[PDB]
Scaffold this motif. Structure first.
Motif, PDB file in Angstrom:
ATOM      1  N   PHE A 199     -12.910 -15.835  37.412  1.00 43.88           N
ATOM      2  CA  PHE A 199     -14.082 -15.097  37.840  1.00 43.88           C
ATOM      3  C   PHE A 199     -15.290 -15.436  36.972  1.00 43.88           C
ATOM      4  O   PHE A 199     -15.136 -15.806  35.803  1.00 43.88           O
ATOM      5  CB  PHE A 199     -13.804 -13.598  37.782  1.00 43.88           C
ATOM      6  CG  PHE A 199     -12.813 -13.142  38.804  1.00 43.88           C
ATOM      7  CD1 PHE A 199     -13.222 -12.807  40.073  1.00 43.88           C
ATOM      8  CD2 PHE A 199     -11.468 -13.075  38.502  1.00 43.88           C
ATOM      9  CE1 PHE A 199     -12.314 -12.404  41.020  1.00 43.88           C
ATOM     10  CE2 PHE A 199     -10.555 -12.669  39.445  1.00 43.88           C
ATOM     11  CZ  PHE A 199     -10.978 -12.337  40.706  1.00 43.88           C
ATOM     12  N   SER A 206     -12.091 -12.689  33.598  1.00 39.13           N
ATOM     13  CA  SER A 206     -10.718 -12.549  34.056  1.00 39.13           C
ATOM     14  C   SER A 206     -10.339 -13.779  34.860  1.00 39.13           C
ATOM     15  O   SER A 206     -11.146 -14.296  35.636  1.00 39.13           O
ATOM     16  CB  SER A 206     -10.539 -11.297  34.917  1.00 39.13           C
ATOM     17  OG  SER A 206     -10.804 -10.122  34.176  1.00 39.13           O
ATOM     18  N   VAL A 233      -6.994 -14.942  37.248  1.00 39.95           N
ATOM     19  CA  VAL A 233      -5.750 -14.484  37.847  1.00 39.95           C
ATOM     20  C   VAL A 233      -5.158 -15.598  38.693  1.00 39.95           C
ATOM     21  O   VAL A 233      -5.863 -16.501  39.156  1.00 39.95           O
ATOM     22  CB  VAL A 233      -5.953 -13.212  38.693  1.00 39.95           C
ATOM     23  CG1 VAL A 233      -6.393 -12.056  37.816  1.00 39.95           C
ATOM     24  CG2 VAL A 233      -6.967 -13.467  39.789  1.00 39.95           C
ATOM     25  N   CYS A 245      -8.967  -3.847  38.851  1.00 41.69           N
ATOM     26  CA  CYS A 245      -8.516  -3.864  40.232  1.00 41.69           C
ATOM     27  C   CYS A 245      -8.917  -5.195  40.849  1.00 41.69           C
ATOM     28  O   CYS A 245     -10.095  -5.563  40.819  1.00 41.69           O
ATOM     29  CB  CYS A 245      -9.124  -2.699  41.012  1.00 41.69           C
ATOM     30  SG  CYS A 245      -8.499  -2.478  42.675  1.00 41.69           S
ATOM     31  N   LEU A 246      -7.946  -5.913  41.401  1.00 39.32           N
ATOM     32  CA  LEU A 246      -8.158  -7.261  41.908  1.00 39.32           C
ATOM     33  C   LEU A 246      -8.101  -7.253  43.428  1.00 39.32           C
ATOM     34  O   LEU A 246      -7.101  -6.827  44.013  1.00 39.32           O
ATOM     35  CB  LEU A 246      -7.121  -8.228  41.344  1.00 39.32           C
ATOM     36  CG  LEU A 246      -6.991  -9.541  42.113  1.00 39.32           C
ATOM     37  CD1 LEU A 246      -8.198 -10.414  41.872  1.00 39.32           C
ATOM     38  CD2 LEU A 246      -5.726 -10.267  41.713  1.00 39.32           C
ATOM     39  N   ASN A 265      -8.251  -9.786  46.695  1.00 40.97           N
ATOM     40  CA  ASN A 265      -7.839 -11.173  46.833  1.00 40.97           C
ATOM     41  C   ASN A 265      -7.960 -11.633  48.277  1.00 40.97           C
ATOM     42  O   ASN A 265      -7.365 -11.029  49.175  1.00 40.97           O
ATOM     43  CB  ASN A 265      -6.401 -11.347  46.347  1.00 40.97           C
ATOM     44  CG  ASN A 265      -6.143 -12.717  45.780  1.00 40.97           C
ATOM     45  OD1 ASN A 265      -6.660 -13.712  46.278  1.00 40.97           O
ATOM     46  ND2 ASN A 265      -5.337 -12.779  44.731  1.00 40.97           N
ATOM     47  N   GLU A 309     -17.956  -5.317  38.295  1.00 39.96           N
ATOM     48  CA  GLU A 309     -17.253  -6.264  39.145  1.00 39.96           C
ATOM     49  C   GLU A 309     -17.966  -7.608  39.151  1.00 39.96           C
ATOM     50  O   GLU A 309     -19.125  -7.724  38.749  1.00 39.96           O
ATOM     51  CB  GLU A 309     -17.133  -5.737  40.576  1.00 39.96           C
ATOM     52  CG  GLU A 309     -18.411  -5.848  41.378  1.00 39.96           C
ATOM     53  CD  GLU A 309     -18.316  -5.144  42.711  1.00 39.96           C
ATOM     54  OE1 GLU A 309     -17.587  -4.135  42.798  1.00 39.96           O
ATOM     55  OE2 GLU A 309     -18.968  -5.600  43.673  1.00 39.96           O
ATOM     56  N   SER A 360     -13.005 -13.534  46.389  1.00 34.84           N
ATOM     57  CA  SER A 360     -12.068 -12.811  45.541  1.00 34.84           C
ATOM     58  C   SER A 360     -12.880 -12.016  44.534  1.00 34.84           C
ATOM     59  O   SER A 360     -13.732 -12.581  43.848  1.00 34.84           O
ATOM     60  CB  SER A 360     -11.109 -13.762  44.825  1.00 34.84           C
ATOM     61  OG  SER A 360     -10.225 -13.047  43.985  1.00 34.84           O
ATOM     62  N   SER A 389     -13.155  -8.724  41.489  1.00 33.81           N
ATOM     63  CA  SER A 389     -12.405  -8.154  40.373  1.00 33.81           C
ATOM     64  C   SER A 389     -13.272  -7.099  39.698  1.00 33.81           C
ATOM     65  O   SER A 389     -14.135  -7.434  38.884  1.00 33.81           O
ATOM     66  CB  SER A 389     -11.989  -9.232  39.385  1.00 33.81           C
ATOM     67  OG  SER A 389     -11.327  -8.668  38.271  1.00 33.81           O
ATOM     68  N   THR A 394     -13.469  -4.077  37.036  1.00 32.25           N
ATOM     69  CA  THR A 394     -12.786  -3.598  35.844  1.00 32.25           C
ATOM     70  C   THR A 394     -13.437  -2.314  35.349  1.00 32.25           C
ATOM     71  O   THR A 394     -14.663  -2.178  35.358  1.00 32.25           O
ATOM     72  CB  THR A 394     -12.765  -4.666  34.736  1.00 32.25           C
ATOM     73  OG1 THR A 394     -12.072  -4.157  33.591  1.00 32.25           O
ATOM     74  CG2 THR A 394     -14.165  -5.108  34.342  1.00 32.25           C
TER      75      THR A 394
END
Ligand SMILES: O=C(/C=C/c1ccc(Cl)cc1)N1CCC2(CC1)CN(Cc1ccc(Cl)c(Cl)c1)C(=O)O2
Lengths: 225, 120, 371, 212
Positions: free
Chosen positions: A177, A190, A192, D135-136, D138, D162, D175, D177, D179
């Motif tokens: 990211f 991050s 993943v 929280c991811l 996807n 995010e 995607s 993410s 946090t």
């Protein structure tokens, strides 16, 4: 061939000073007016200043008046931008453009040859390495489908950090990211990877994190729960 | 306080066609996004299509990609899910939906009751 | 012929009126043509051959004015002269219409074709075309028990009606649309150029009366945005645009002083714009307003006069024919058909006396027309 | 001082479509606007100048035009290299340059729904006194998802952050993410943390949660 070149970007403290230099080749800065267009990270373009060394017409944007000063040493065929009293929102990529004089087609073309842009960073933080933390998945993390897995790379400075999984072996499903700027002036990131179920394939996944401006190469491991 | 009602339906054989329509009563549509849904008996509330505000988008799910078409007319506050080339797998109720967000974040609150559309 | 006793007064009245009016009108028309017997640039030849058609249609008329219930080859000659009246009128009105459209849309292409050679070539082309239109409708001798020429599986009726009337009607209409758009588009152009000049003068005035240079900048930017698209509306247009180039140069010379913050020097440098205006653009605005009215007004009224003569002389008869044949394919005969065709033929022959009305406002020696 | 609004702030189209970007000026500048293209990471490139004239060096599918103070850029056949941000600059005087906000043309695709994952904070992080759950989301196509953290249904605000990736090269999907950062003195609050996700292709908001 006409080709603009910037130089002078880097890290400065809020309130410091900096000197960008827009060297030109091909054309001469006498026959053209050299502008400065900056672009905040993740924002649109905005005009900042210009100089017309044929006459001398240094004008500035309303948000940088009294704080920036643009010069053009036509013996060097370059143009300079003296940025002092830098605020926090002055971090951007500063492009250098070119605009022909009136009358005719040289004016009717807008900025047609830009530089590559140099990035400045106004921060009050110092260099520090990243603290890699695992994002561990549980055994209940969709037992039967796929289970996401990652590791958190936060509290580092300056910007560039690259992350790879298993020394570049995992390239499928790996999402890294963009670094978000935390409230403490530091960066957080991050990365993943979506590997399948059945004990995560029973491979000891590792995220290789290397931060070259701090010479940190922490390679943490991730384990299921 | 603003509910909507839907039209269309029928038992059409494979290869046929329909033209659904959900009509909103009590609010304007020209600034919102109207999306269609689908519930088969046993399968829980799949997505079908969505119409953005005005000429800025119309997105369909991967299963119904190419066969269907959602239009939009702000005169009578209706959007039409034109169904074509109906395979015998589309036997499901077709709810309409509206989102409370104008950034298309998809906050679906008002639905309707759907129209049973079976194929054989 | 239930109204034959009515027709015994109706048709001699109308055809006597048409005979006398068209004859004296075309008489004075060709007298004024003799008064200018050589100068026929591009339209006078169209007008003169249409006069020829009308006057032969009139010279074949004095046999038909003596009519009652009661030869054959003479009746065939009357049929052919009627058809070479009506079809020649239609096709020559539409060729004169496309002549005017070419003149007042592409004037360089008009001067390419304004010579006598190609113009007379197209004239003789449509003249042999109207001679080709009349002989197919001349197979049987119309004598049947006068003539009894009126009635009569037919299928070529609407084909001739289309080619003869429908295609021509669409042409004249699109020519009129092109003329109205070309004269209406160099109209909003002149309107916006005058608006640019007005906003330039008003902002120069607010400059010369204002202080607080933050607003002399606001006036100068409007002045520059006006000049930049005022110059967008050859060896004379170059000197037109060079004046606006030096005007925008003076605007910039004032605007950089205003940016520096010298409100007195800015009004001093803005003062030179009225001098530049008087020296470069005042002597061109009168030309751009007056010359670019005159010949195009003649063209516009000629097109609209051809349209009104068309839609009141050739539209009723031909829509009556398409109505009489639209009754076919689905299936008394002298009920609402003979008097309808009677009066519509009266109109289609009344074109011959409405034709001097074309010339008196359009072409072919308007000297005695004004006199 | 001349505002320049560029309306369709994000277009979605596929290879071969005909896109149209419009742009409207506050004042009435003359036919002096330019259109640019900025591929991510590089500098802009001139496409149109004088609001209609094509620059020499760019393909002829781009074609701008002008109507009053409404300038519009049209691409005829959207090749797979015309996927970048397009700006709208007016240039009336040297010191009066204002750019538009820039539309981002992107790849059209079929709507997918985000596969939500939540991650508890590592106990190695809790040695430092801070806690950051993440929280991811996807592989969802429209970039319009919204995350809303909840700690016993307490809608958090100001402590979440995010960052969405660019459009993927393989299947053209995003995607995200989000946090949620907290101190360990505050992480010992309500012992269940939840991540609620509303997406346009989602019927009901998916809530992935865990207990502390
Ligand atoms: O009926 C038709 C046409 C049919 C037709 C329609 C469509 C197609 Cl495609 C082909 C043919 N005309 C009637 C006779 C006219 C014009 C042609 C008028 N006139 C003098 C005249 C003579 C006697 C009277 Cl009683 C009156 Cl008042 C007037 C003449 O010389 O001829």
């Amino acid at each position: 061939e006409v080709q603009l070149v910037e130089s002078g970007g880097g890290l400065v403290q809020p309130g410091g000073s900096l000197r960008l230099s827009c060297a030109a080749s091909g054309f001469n800065v006498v026959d053209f007016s050299l502008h400065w267009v900056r672009q905040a990270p993740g924002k649109g373009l905005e005009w900042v200043a210009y100089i017309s060394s044929s006459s001398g017409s240094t004008s500035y944007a309303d948000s940088v008046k009294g704080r920036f000063t643009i010069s053009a040493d036509t013996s060097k065929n370059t143009a300079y931008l003296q940025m002092n009293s830098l605020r926090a929102e002055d971090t951007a990529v500063y492009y250098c453009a070119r605009w022909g004089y009136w009358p005719g087609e040289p004016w009717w073309k807008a900025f047609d040859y830009w530089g590559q842009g140099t990035l400045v960073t106004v921060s009050s933080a110092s260099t520090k390495g990243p603290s890699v933390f695992p994002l561990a998945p549980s055994s209940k993390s969709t037992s039967g489908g796929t289970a996401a897995l990652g590791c958190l790379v936060k509290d580092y400075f300056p910007e560039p950090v690259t992350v790879s999984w298993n020394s570049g072996a995992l390239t499928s499903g790996v999402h890294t990211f963009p670094a978000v700027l935390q409230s403490s002036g530091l960066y957080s990131l991050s990365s993943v990877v979506t590997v399948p179920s059945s004990s995560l394939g029973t491979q000891t996944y590792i995220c290789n994190v290397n931060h070259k401006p701090s010479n940190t190469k922490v390679d943490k491991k991730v384990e299921p729960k | 306080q603003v509910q909507l009602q839907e039209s269309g339906g029928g038992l059409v054989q494979p290869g046929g066609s329909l033209r659904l329509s959900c009509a909103a009563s009590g609010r304007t549509i020209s600034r919102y996004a109207m999306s269609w849904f689908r519930q088969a008996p046993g399968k829980e509330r799949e997505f079908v299509a969505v119409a953005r505000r005005s000429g800025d988008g119309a997105f369909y799910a991967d299963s119904v990609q190419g066969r269907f078409t959602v239009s939009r007319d702000d005169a009578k506050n209706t959007v039409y899910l034109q169904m074509n080339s109906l395979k015998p797998e589309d036997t499901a109720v077709y709810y309409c939906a509206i989102d409370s967000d104008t950034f298309y974040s998809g906050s679906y609150d008002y639905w309707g009751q759907g129209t049973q559309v079976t194929v054989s | 012929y239930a109204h034959h006793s009515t027709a015994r007064i109706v048709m001699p009245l109308h055809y006597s009126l048409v005979f006398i009016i068209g004859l004296v009108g075309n008489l004075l028309a060709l007298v004024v043509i003799v008064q200018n017997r050589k100068k026929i640039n591009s339209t006078t030849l169209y007008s003169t051959n249409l006069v020829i058609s009308d006057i032969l249609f009139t010279t074949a008329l004095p046999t038909r004015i003596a009519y009652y219930a009661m030869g054959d080859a003479l009746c065939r000659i009357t049929a052919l002269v009627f058809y070479i009246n009506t079809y020649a009128g239609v096709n020559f009105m539409t060729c004169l219409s496309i002549d005017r459209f070419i003149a007042v849309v592409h004037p360089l292409r008009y001067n390419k074709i304004k010579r006598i050679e190609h113009a007379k070539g197209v004239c003789i082309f449509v003249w042999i075309l109207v001679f080709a239109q009349t002989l197919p409708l001349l197979i049987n001798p119309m004598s049947k028990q006068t003539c009894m020429e009126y009635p009569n599986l037919p299928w070529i009726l609407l084909g001739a009606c289309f080619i003869g009337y429908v295609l021509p009607l669409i042409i004249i209409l699109i020519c009129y649309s092109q003329i109205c758009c070309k004269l209406f588009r160099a109209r909003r152009q002149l309107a916006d150029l005058e608006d640019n000049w007005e906003t330039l003068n008003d902002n120069l005035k607010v400059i010369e009366k204002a202080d607080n240079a933050a607003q002399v900048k606001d006036a100068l930017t409007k002045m520059r945005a006006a000049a930049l698209d005022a110059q967008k509306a050859s060896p004379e247009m170059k000197d037109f645009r060079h004046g606006f180039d030096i005007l925008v140069g003076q605007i910039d010379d004032a605007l950089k002083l205003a940016n520096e913050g010298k409100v007195k020097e800015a009004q001093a440098a803005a003062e030179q714009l009225k001098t530049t205006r008087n020296a470069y653009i005042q002597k061109y605005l009168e030309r751009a307003r007056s010359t670019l009215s005159g010949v195009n007004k003649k063209a516009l009224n000629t097109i609209i006069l051809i349209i009104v003569v068309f839609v009141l002389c050739f539209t009723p008869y031909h829509v009556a024919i398409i109505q009489h044949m639209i009754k076919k394919l689905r299936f008394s005969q002298r009920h609402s058909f003979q008097i309808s065709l009677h009066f519509t033929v009266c109109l289609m022959n009344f074109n011959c006396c409405m034709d001097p009305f074309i010339y008196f406002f359009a072409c072919k020696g308007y000297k005695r027309k004004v006199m | 001082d001349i505002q320049m609004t560029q309306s369709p702030s994000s277009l979605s189209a596929s290879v071969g479509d005909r896109v149209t970007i419009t742009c409207r000026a506050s004042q009435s500048v003359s036919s002096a606007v330019a259109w640019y293209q900025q591929k991510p990471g590089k500098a802009p490139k001139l496409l149109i100048y004088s609001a209609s004239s094509l620059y020499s060096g760019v393909p002829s599918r781009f074609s701008g035009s002008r109507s009053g103070t409404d300038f519009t850029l049209t691409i005829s056949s959207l090749q797979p290299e015309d996927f970048a941000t397009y700006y709208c600059q007016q240039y009336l005087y040297y010191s009066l340059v204002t750019f538009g906000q820039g539309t981002k043309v992107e790849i059209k695709r079929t709507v997918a729904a985000p596969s939500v994952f939540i991650f508890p904070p590592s106990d190695s992080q809790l040695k430092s006194g801070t806690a950051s759950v993440v929280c991811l989301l996807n592989n969802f196509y429209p970039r319009e998802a919204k995350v809303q953290w909840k700690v016993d249904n307490a809608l958090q605000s100001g402590n979440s952050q995010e960052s969405v990736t660019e459009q993927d090269s393989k299947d053209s999907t995003y995607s995200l993410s989000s946090t949620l950062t907290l101190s360990k003195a505050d992480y010992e609050k309500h012992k269940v943390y939840a991540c609620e996700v509303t997406h346009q292709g989602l019927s009901s908001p998916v809530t992935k949660s865990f207990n502390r």
